[PDB]
Amino acid sequence: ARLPLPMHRDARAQQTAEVVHAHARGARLTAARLGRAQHQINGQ
């Protein structure tokens, strides 16, 4: 185990990619909540 396995660099990418769509999803909501706010802002 103390040695790097023959393959894994792909897993490296897999890990970060998760974070990608991850943090991405959260920000999506932030803007989403903001969007209704703006739509409401538009109404007022």
Binding site: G26, T30, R33, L34, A37, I41
Partner: peptide, 11 residues
Amino acid sequence: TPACAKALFEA
């Protein structure tokens, strides 16, 4: 994230 929540509350 907390700052964003505060901004949403202000809005």
